[PDB]
């Protein structure tokens, strides 16, 4: 391996310059299988990586695990291997009453409720997605006619207190996050997830292109959801090769 | 008879306008409005000069913000009270990237928040991000006139001098926070400095208003008219797509 | 034409002046200048209108700053380049104390730094404090004409609306930082709100420049003024030449 | 399932109140194998879990994945299922010159270079280990005579820039972390890893007991990446049942 | 006269002492020293009163810190200059858990840093953590002496009043940061408030000095607004 | 005692509304000796208090101990007892080359390098002195005849790393304070001391008047250090000034 965690070499990529990066290792093969010539590359820790082909060009599918820290490892090591464009495809809880389960959300930028993004840029720097990538995702969502919402996502280092969940062991939420969901709602934030702030900040501050699309699995106020978002990211990738 | 404290405008003055182009300098307001139909002066108070015009049958506002986030936040809030829901910032700017030359145009996707006013709308974690539709329209408009365009991040500073790490000053000093900062933004891909976008983009993105920003490059510290006109044609053409 | 980037002034225009009175509104510049000897227009560019006059045979500058720290920081810097060493801000203001009434005059000893520009000169730990000689001159000028004067702390905000906890706005919301903030400043004895002094005082106190500030109360949140605050700033200038 | 991520029910725990939590899903089976009656429970995402028995009491082994965010999910859901004591067994990079690869490091408390700890307690709160757990770990290390060091650990949300690694795609480290390793070294910090700040903070602030131990796999005074602790964590567990 | 600026002590005065017991109150120094052999008064300047004594044949220093991190930081630094490498604070404290009784003994594993001086040694992310051997000696000493003992986190405040969310004050105002804070620390399991441990533990842990912290409960805040001394002496014996 | 630490009652004050607050308990008697009929009231921990009479009015002298935390206790408890005006008198090391030993420093406001101030007001709030107190101190300095500097003071929770001293056990200074003395120098900060940030902030944010004056007994930039009596003649000067200022504030 050329890299410490992923267990991949530059040759494994066969010239790939774009990676699709879901959180769940189990989702990796499902995405690769939608493209031509899917081949498993490696599986270490939460990092499962496959290669496939899109319109004749090699593409990587590599899981990030949950959270900015493992995401930052996958992105860095893929970048070392030659990836310059990253498309995250994830799941998300919506926090706006008008956003229905199964909807598709394209993230323009993220509220940085993580710690890893700070390891790349100070908080003043925007966790902003690449324009080409965001455009490709939006245009891909339109081509398949999905109900799409485009805007800001809150990206949290926790699933529970940072998304102001009280249904927990302690039932306590620290002061910083008490009342935070309503605040994000009033500010027009669409949804919560846990990787985009790190992904977008680390890419935008290092000359890498990143986009973020997600399928709505719950509304904080199903099957064809993932499929739709997954279709969208693969189609978007075609436009970015 | 004004409905707002600073702008000296009433809702009626807007004639149903829902979009405003917002340059910094009052002296540029008529010139922009003059590119559109039936331009008329509305008012002039402090750094807030407003004109109404018409674009493909729809009323549009052109209103200056003055220099800096504080004045901008006043113009934007009061225009919002008056019914504006879409704001397009037009400016001329320097650049901090060597590959960016005078004559190029910059469309800002999001800004580094080196201001104070943005914090009065959203905590620092919140992204000073432009509206997708506005950014799209600005890029496509730049495309239609064949402008050499750069799309990316802009550093938005409450100062012209130390926050842009200028040392040619009275004190010749730059506070620790900003010492070495220009090189840091350069390494992070930041295109340029200006002084209003962090405030504009943050206050709009966190209050359901659409904002975008375009600027012509007139200078570059690492290394004019046409550039300006281009930027202005771009912002007017973009406004047409957003009505 | 100009020794500075924005003001459109040369050192020659100042005729040796070392003190500037700095109102916010360009419209007020001529009025202040008119109270002194030999008043003449200098220049007008953006929100920076400048006049020169004379007191006791010494040149004095009057120059507007525009609204807010950013434009203030430009005016003060460029005036400092041209030789100004003492700055007296004159404003009108809204009081936050029940017993500070319209028509009262406020002299600011130091400001609560609710701005961004002050941080471009000194870290937050540094006091946005007025120069003692300036504050003395203003207080003594105020007493010499019998104004009802309050001396103390001013809250200096980058916004007119949320930073001063105004809810009569488009969104009707105030970010967490500022919710409940007016009552807090009130309990801490803060006199009033305005928008330029944190920047002015900090940038002067941290770079060997003298600054003071006086303001007329023309309204009170908890419920001819110009002429008096203006008379005070000119009489104070007389004492500082 | 009783919880959203782990795919476990309280019944799967068989009354277990202690969990050993490695970062790598592949280490779980190996840890479980050192105990009696090892049984696989589930594997979802980076969360692989096994049950075993120690001195006739059920014990859980469950991986956390890399980083605070996924750790916070595993700990929370284990807590919901009934776990009250958590022993992290990790790998680590030493930052002191005389720590040998293979050495066992027991963490008393962590430098919070993560984001997730802040979702449980403000930064002022110490990421401190439980005294009984730390004691059990030290005493267990003593009983097998491993080379052991006890002290403070820097816990980072990144593998690369937050641990001041420069052999990366960008080769740059953000201002906050430039010169940081030398600083921690001067302060006597022993090592870097990526989970303890979150684990220790979230446990200490919610009435859960946590201990932290790791084997050194690289010495950072010499290189950024490499070309006993497990026995100790199991023995320590015995003492805490 | 004195090898350090504030304490008025010389390296000679310590007679090779490498451990110091550091109470807050100068008036308690003589009392503690008296529990050991050959107690001799050394110096008394400002809030810094110091005695030397002997414990199982070895020199030991007792030196007051005064109230608060700043004065503590001076005493610890200057004692370190004179050769002290182990510091055991013995204090008084208000419990904030209902289950902790007055007269109970609290051993601190780490402190909530509600002080400013700790930041002069390490950034906020660094833990104000006690030395493991010192903490162990205190817990073991507490068994030996016999006392109801709790081991855990302590909130260390730069103020006695607003930082411990006391309202019995001139202004009756508690700043936003501290409004509701006691109940927050309570829910997070914090045992008690005092005013020196965050500075002490942070400055020691970040400078290769060993520090431990024990205190006797003199009030319980959920109700209103000699074991510890024997314990700190016994712990010192275990650390020489 | 009406208060938890000071061992004082309202009766002890005899209607006093002004307190002079040196840091060192040993200085309290010395300052009181500059006034009429001084009597010792109490001594507990670092808090030694005396009452004296100034132009026929009761005045308290009470030590604060070193640092914002003990200072906050003294000021708060004195406020409870009825004190409304506080004058700190210190001795200090200057950091400007032009500020000479023997000079007197009057502080208009302080750089908040302390923790206790934050327990009264967020960092944005200025650690600013009361105008009447500052005026009285400046005027008294002129009555006494001192060479006076008026301006900003850096108020640190430590004597060592926070004042960027490297002559210490570890010989290291945390990142925050590395290079900080040169920064404060460039910003015109006059000196370091350790109580004013807390004092000035807690008073300005609670309707209390506070001023600060100090005698310069050493300069961080100069090689030579005044003899056995670095303070004494200078100390005496600042003390005479704080008493003379108190006269104007009664
Ligand atoms: O509310 C949610 C729902 C889903 N997700 C999100 N928050 O975090 C993302 C994690 O990777 C993982 C955590 O369940 O899935 C994404
Ligand atoms: O330098 C290192 C070496 C090992 N580890 C550490 N940093 O982070 C821990 C991660 O879980 C994972 C990162 O590889 O293993 C632990
Ligand atoms: O609530 C309390 C009670 C006692 N103490 C504490 N807080 O601070 C410690 C101080 O040294 C001093 C404060 O009175 O005593 C310790
Ligand atoms: K993970
Ligand atoms: K302006
Ligand atoms: K003290």
Residue D121 has which token pair? 């307690």
Q: Whole-angstrom Cα distance, residue E230 to residue E131?
A: 20
Catalytic residue positions of F?
5, 77, 165, 220
Cβ proximity of F42 and F33 under 8 Å? no
> Cβ D186–F175 below 8 Å, yes or no?
no
CA of D237 to the centre of ligand 3 (A): 38
Supply angle C-alpha F47, F50, F53, rounded to 5.
150
E strand or H helix at C201? helix C197-205
Phi-psi sector, A174: left (phi>0), alpha (psi -120 to 50), beta: beta
Q: How far is D72 from chain B (nearest CA, A)?
A: 21
Q: Whole-angstrom Cα distance, residue E27 to residue E118?
A: 25
> Domain range spanning residue F57?
1-250
Give the nearest ligand 2 atom to D67 CA: 11
Q: Partners of C53 in the beta sheet?
A: C60
Cβ proximity of E33 and E62 under 8 Å? yes
The DSSP-derived string for E139-198 is HHHHHHH---EEEEEEEEES-SSGGGT--SSSS----GGGTTHHHHHHHTT--EEESSHH
Cα distances (Å, whole numbers) of residue C100 to A92, C136, C151, C218: 52, 20, 11, 10
Residue nearest to atom 7 of ligand 2 (CA): D193
- For residue B52, the 8-state DSSP code is E
Q: Which residue of D has its CA nearest to A1?
A: D227
Report helix angle A196-204 to A68-80, nearest 10.
40
- D119 classed as catalytic: no
CA atoms within 13 A on the CB side of A53: 6
Q: Partners of A106 in the beta sheet?
A: A150, A213
Supply angle C-alpha A221, A222, A228, rounded to 5.
110
Residues 6+ apart with CB under 8 A from C172: none
Residues in chain B within 8 Å Cβ distance of A112: 125, 127
* The total number of structural domains that make up chain A: 1
Residues in chain B within 8 Å Cβ distance of D172: 187
Q: Is D90 in the pocket of ligand 2 (CB under 6 A)?
A: yes
Helix, strand, coil percentages, rounded to 5, for chain E: 30, 30, 35
Residue nearest to atom 7 of ligand 1 (CA): A193
Q: Whose structure tokens read 């501290």?
A: E178
The DSSP-derived string for B68-137 is SHHHHHHHHHHHHHTT--EEEEEEEE--SSTT--TT-EEEEEEEEEESSGGGGTS-TTS-EEPPHHHHHH
Q: Whole-angstrom Cα distance, residue E113 to residue E193?
A: 11
Dihedral pair phi/psi, residue C171, rounded to 5° = -85, -25
Cβ proximity of E106 and E197 under 8 Å? no
Residues in chain B within 8 Å Cβ distance of D170: 187
Residue nearest to atom 15 of ligand 2 (CA): D91
Alpha helices, DSSP H only, in C83-180? 132-144
Residue nearest to atom 8 of ligand 2 (CA): D193
Alpha helices, DSSP H only, in E18-146? 29-33, 69-81, 132-145
> Cβ A175–E184 below 8 Å, yes or no?
yes
- D44 classed as catalytic: no
Q: Do chains D and F touch (3 or more CB pairs under 8 A)?
A: yes
- Return the CATH number at B151: 3.40.50.1580
Resolution (A): 1.7
CA of B68 to the centre of ligand 5 (A): 6
Enumerate neighbours of B (3 or more CB pairs within 8 A). Answer: A, C, D, F
Give the nearest ligand 2 atom to D156 CA: 8
Q: Whose structure tokens read 């699933």?
A: A159
> Cβ E187–A172 below 8 Å, yes or no?
yes
> Cβ A175–E187 below 8 Å, yes or no?
no
The DSSP-derived string for D75-127 is HHHHHHHT--EEEEEEEEEE-STTPPTT-EEEEEEEEEESSGGGGTS-TTS-E
Q: Which residue of A has its CA nearest to B190?
A: A205
Dihedral pair phi/psi, residue C229, rounded to 5° = -60, -35
The DSSP-derived string for F175-242 is GGGTTHHHHHHHTT--EEESSHHHHHHHHHTTT-EEEEEEEEEEETT-S----TTTTHHHHHHHHHHH
Cβ proximity of D234 and D35 under 8 Å? yes
For residue E32, give the 3-state DSSP assignment. Answer: helix
Cβ proximity of B61 and B126 under 8 Å? no
Residues 6+ apart with CB under 8 A from E157: E114, E115, E163, E164, E193, E194, E195, F69, F119
| E183 burial level (CB within 10 Å; 0-12, 13-18, 19+) | exposed
Q: Whole-angstrom Cα distance, residue F180 to residue F161?
A: 10
> Cβ A111–B127 below 8 Å, yes or no?
yes
> Taking every pair of C-alpha atoms in chain F, what is the biggest distance, in angstroms?
52
Q: Which ligand has the minimum distance to the alpha carbon of residue D64?
A: 4
| E172 burial level (CB within 10 Å; 0-12, 13-18, 19+) | exposed
Q: Which residue of C has its CA nearest to F185?
A: C206
Residues 6+ apart with CB under 8 A from F159: E5, E6, E70, E73, E74, E77, F66, F165, F194
Q: Whole-angstrom Cα distance, residue D143 to residue D135?
A: 12
Measured in whole angstroms, the distance separating CA D214 from the mean position of its chain's CA atoms is 7
Residues in chain F within 8 Å Cβ distance of B173: 186
A191-193 vs F148-156, strand pairing mode: unpaired
Enumerate neighbours of F (3 or more CB pairs within 8 A). Answer: B, C, D, E
Q: Whole-angstrom Cα distance, residue F58 to residue F38?
A: 10
Q: Whole-angstrom Cα distance, residue C195 to residue F16?
A: 40
For residue F114, give the 3-state DSSP assignment. Answer: coil
The DSSP-derived string for C55-71 is ETTEEEEEE---SSHHH
For chain B, list residues whose CB is within 8 angstroms of any CB belonging to chain F: 171, 173, 175-176
CA quadruple D181, D187, D189, D194: dihedral sign:
negative
């Amino acid at each position: 391996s050329d890299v410490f965690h992923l267990g991949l070499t530059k040759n494994d990529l066969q010239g790939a310059q774009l990676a699709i990066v879901p959180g769940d290792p189990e989702r990796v093969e499902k995405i690769a299988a939608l493209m031509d010539k899917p081949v498993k590359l490696a599986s270490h820790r939460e990092f499962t990586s496959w290669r496939a082909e899109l319109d004749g060009k090699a593409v990587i599918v590599c899981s990030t695990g949950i959270g900015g820290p493992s995401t930052s490892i996958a992105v860095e090591e893929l970048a070392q291997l030659g990836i310059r464009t990253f498309l995250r495809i994830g799941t998300t809880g919506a926090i706006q009453p008008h956003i229905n389960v199964g909807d598709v959300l394209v993230t323009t930028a993220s509220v940085r409720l993580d710690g890893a993004s700070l390891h790349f840029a100070p908080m003043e720097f925007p966790a902003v997605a690449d324009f080409a990538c965001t455009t490709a995702l939006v245009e891909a969502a339109k081509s398949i006619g999905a109900t799409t919402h485009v805007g800001v996502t809150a990206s949290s280092d926790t699933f529970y207190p940072g998304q102001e969940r009280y249904d927990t062991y302690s039932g306590r939420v620290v002061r910083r996050f008490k009342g935070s969901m309503e605040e994000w709602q009033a500010m027009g934030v669409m949804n919560y997830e846990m990787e985009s702030a790190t992904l977008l900040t680390m890419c935008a501050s290092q000359g890498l292109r990143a986009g973020m699309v997600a399928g709505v699995i719950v509304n904080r106020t199903m099957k064809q959801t993932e499929s739709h978002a997954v279709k969208i990211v693969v189609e978007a990738a075609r436009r970015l090769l």
